Amino acid sequence: PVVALCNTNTNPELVDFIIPANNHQPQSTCLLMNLLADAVAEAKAMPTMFAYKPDEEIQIEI
Amino acid sequence: YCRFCAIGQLRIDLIDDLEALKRFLSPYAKINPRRITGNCQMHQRHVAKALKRARYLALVPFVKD
Amino acid sequence: EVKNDDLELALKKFKRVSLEIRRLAQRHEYHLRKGMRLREKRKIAQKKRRKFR
Amino acid sequence: QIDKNGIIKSAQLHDKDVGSIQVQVSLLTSQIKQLTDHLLANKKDFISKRGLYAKVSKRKRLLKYLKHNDLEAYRNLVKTLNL
Amino acid sequence: MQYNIILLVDGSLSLEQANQVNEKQQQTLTNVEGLQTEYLGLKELAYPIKKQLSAHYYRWKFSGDNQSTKDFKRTANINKQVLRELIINLEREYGYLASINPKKQQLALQKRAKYDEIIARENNPENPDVPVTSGLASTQPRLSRTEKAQKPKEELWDVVQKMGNFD
Amino acid sequence: ITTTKPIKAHFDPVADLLTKINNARKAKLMTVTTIASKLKIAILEILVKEGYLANFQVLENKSKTKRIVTFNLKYTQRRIPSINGVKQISKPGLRIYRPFEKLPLVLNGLGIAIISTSDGVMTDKVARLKKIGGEILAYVW
RNA sequence: UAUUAAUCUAGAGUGUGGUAGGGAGUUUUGGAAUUUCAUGUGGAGCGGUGAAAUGCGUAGAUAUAUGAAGGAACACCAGUGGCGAAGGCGAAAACUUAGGCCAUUACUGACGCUUAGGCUUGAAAGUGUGGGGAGCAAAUAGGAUUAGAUACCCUAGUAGUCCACACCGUAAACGAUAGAUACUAGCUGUCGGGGCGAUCCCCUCGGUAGUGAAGUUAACACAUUAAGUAUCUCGCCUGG
Numbered sequence: 001p002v003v004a005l006c007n008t009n010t011n012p013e014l015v016d017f018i019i020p021a022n023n024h025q026p027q028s029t030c031l032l033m034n035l036l037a038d039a040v041a042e043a044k045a046m047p048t049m050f051a052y053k054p055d056e057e058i059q060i061e062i
Numbered sequence: 063y064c065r066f067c068a069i070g071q072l073r074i075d076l077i078d079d080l081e082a083l084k085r086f087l088s089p090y091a092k093i094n095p096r097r098i099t100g101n102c103q104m105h106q107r108h109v110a111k112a113l114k115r116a117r118y119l120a121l122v123p124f125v126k127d
Numbered sequence: 128e129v130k131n132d133d134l135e136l137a138l139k140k141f142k143r144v145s146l147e148i149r150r151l152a153q154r155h156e157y158h159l160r161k162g163m164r165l166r167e168k169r170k171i172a173q174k175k176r177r178k179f180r
Numbered sequence: 181q182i183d184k185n186g187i188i189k190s191a192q193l194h195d196k197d198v199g200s201i202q203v204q205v206s207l208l209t210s211q212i213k214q215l216t217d218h219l220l221a222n223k224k225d226f227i228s229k230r231g232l233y234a235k236v237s238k239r240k241r242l243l244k245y246l247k248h249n250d251l252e253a254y255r256n257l258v259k260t261l262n263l
Numbered sequence: 264m265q266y267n268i269i270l271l272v273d274g275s276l277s278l279e280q281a282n283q284v285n286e287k288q289q290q291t292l293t294n295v296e297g298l299q300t301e302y303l304g305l306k307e308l309a310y311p312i313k314k315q316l317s318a319h320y321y322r323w324k325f326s327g328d329n330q331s332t333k334d335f336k337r338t339a340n341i342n343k344q345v346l347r348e349l350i351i352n353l354e355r356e357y358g359y360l361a362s363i364n365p366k367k368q369q370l371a372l373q374k375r376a377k378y379d380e381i382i383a384r385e386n387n388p389e390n391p392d393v394p395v396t397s398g399l400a401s402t403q404p405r406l407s408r409t410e411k412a413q414k415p416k417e418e419l420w421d422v423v424q425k426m427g428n429f430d
Numbered sequence: 431i432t433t434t435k436p437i438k439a440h441f442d443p444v445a446d447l448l449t450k451i452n453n454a455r456k457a458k459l460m461t462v463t464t465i466a467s468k469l470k471i472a473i474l475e476i477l478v479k480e481g482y483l484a485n486f487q488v489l490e491n492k493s494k495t496k497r498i499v500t501f502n503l504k505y506t507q508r509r510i511p512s513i514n515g516v517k518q519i520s521k522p523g524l525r526i527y528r529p530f531e532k533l534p535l536v537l538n539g540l541g542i543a544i545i546s547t548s549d550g551v552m553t554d555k556v557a558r559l560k561k562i563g564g565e566i567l568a569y570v571w
Numbered sequence: 572u573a574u575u576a577a578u579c580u581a582g583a584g585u586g587u588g589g590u591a592g593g594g595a596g597u598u599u600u601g602g603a604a605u606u607u608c609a610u611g612u613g614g615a616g617c618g619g620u621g622a623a624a625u626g627c628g629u630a631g632a633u634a635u636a637u638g639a640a641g642g643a644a645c646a647c648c649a650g651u652g653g654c655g656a657a658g659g660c661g662a663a664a665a666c667u668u669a670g671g672c673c674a675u676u677a678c679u680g681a682c683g684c685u686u687a688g689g690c691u692u693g694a695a696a697g698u699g700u701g702g703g704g705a706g707c708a709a710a711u712a713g714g715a716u717u718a719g720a721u722a723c724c725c726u727a728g729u730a731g732u733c734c735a736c737a738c739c740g741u742a743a744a745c746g747a748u749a750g751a752u753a754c755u756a757g758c759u760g761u762c763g764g765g766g767c768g769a770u771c772c773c774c775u776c777g778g779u780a781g782u783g784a785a786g787u788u789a790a791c792a793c794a795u796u797a798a799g800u801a802u803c804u805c806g807c808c809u810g811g
Contacts, residue, residue: 266665329667348600354664356592363589369768369770396766401765401767
């Protein structure tokens, strides 16, 4: 299998696990990537960073 | 932009707006393309017919070079 | 033609309008049929649309 | 001109029916009378002849439908002779 | 129906003779005379008509029967004192219904919108803002009544797990 | 409920309802509306009470002029249609009948069919049980 | 299912209101333009070709100002335009009129699809009667092309090329999709009506266009104007 950050208009039949969130814009992609990294980071006995911290994420573009 | 799609004068003849017809008239007594009239079909055919009307009545020259 | 009052701007206008006149003349020295007429009419329409689109 | 407003009120069975069969056949025969003169005037207006063929075919269909379903289908013959 | 008639005069003659010949042409009408008397002064033609350069243009509009037109056609052409013969009944696309004409506000909106009075106003057409009337009533309502009782089912998306038990 | 749009019978009851079944099976939809008819009522109820599609309702307008029926098809969370193919052997101009001895089976282990002999709708198994032959509606699988 | 008596409107038409379109014919004209004939200007060339020839040319050619005569087609708006059963329909009208479209909350009630037979038109050419031959140009001739010029260009020129009567019915008369009732992903551009309501867009009923799912077709490719799944009626295919 494989999981996909499913942007709308994509084929759902190819994908097996659907993540319906924006990915063309970076402001959502950064948060989603950080969340999935935190989800996978528990395997190392290394504590998570986000999803439990009240501090807001960073975003810088120009 | 079209002068005639926005006001809705609903009738075209020689004494509705003759100076508008002159503005629509070319410098060489012709008819301007779609890029000037600002519309596609119906006010355009109206003004073309009216310019022909005045042409037959000799309100604007057939040719003027 | 008219409007010859500038050394070169009027010249540019004159040459452009004369090129238009020549193109309008190009369809008036040979024989053609109605279907052929519709053919170059559609071709010119498509070419101008590609010029603008 | 056919003057529909003047002929609608002359073949009716009620005071509100406007789509009855009798008013339909009256309209059809009025069109026949008008367009016969029109075609005998203009002998090359063939689209008009096709349209007249269409209305006469429709009138024949209506007459057949009446003569099939309803016995009372010959009031319009005694006033305007047909067939 | 109503008609629109344009009439011409020969040469640069006086105005009284023009009115007289206009009146003479008017009596040609078969049964109905609802003439309107006005003229466009004097305008110089851009090209000669027969041999002249200027003439008087007169206008008429009456409401009568359609037979009042052919007589003018064989009379005006016979009269050598006319130069043009425009005769239009009504058949250019026209509207007079009293539900569309009361819309001249556009013009009232137009000039003020485009008139330049302050250096701060910046406007350009072809701009969408979608003013809302809050109600259209164009929905074609059709209600129904149920006559049998059965139970429907809810639907979700086809979420598939590839055996989910590799452990 | 209150679809607020008109529907009409297309050409003929049997093929009219089979067209909507075709639409259901190919478009992978849920609810399809159509007009009502006693034959369609009977076939829908015999088809649903044997467990082959979802439920359906019969509806009527404000005035006693028109009766319509909508129908739903059984589906699964796995998104699998319950119908694989429908085909009518009888068609306008071809009304073929069978006797009891020659009753056409329908891929015996799988298929379902309706035979209108004399009493509305009877499925193939009860048709054999009563030993009566009639007019075969269509094959569904 | 037939057969049947009465039925009820959504099928289907008719009325009402709005709206659109080079739809058809008839009758009047207008322009620029070509050709020709004239009145003045001028003197050796003018008209054609990968290069040259036929032809015209002091009985002032060409060019050039004006006039006069006349036959055909209606530049310009004319577009991814609109109607038309098909072909087609573009200068201006008046007339008789033809079919739509949209809300049809009105009217009647199955009258609706097809229809081999029978009729209505029919791109062009040609045929037989009147105008005209202004331009055009099959055929014929003359001059060059190559062994060859009945064709390839130039000069004229034969009827026809239009308007009226009677024909003849063939077109690659093409969307190479017979004609109607259903439904089905979307997306974009574009014409009309309704309300909305400056143009700008929001929807609905519709037609005209591309893009492109499943699905289909051998493939190309088709798709909300099916070649998809259905169904109905007339025709055609059984090898050149």
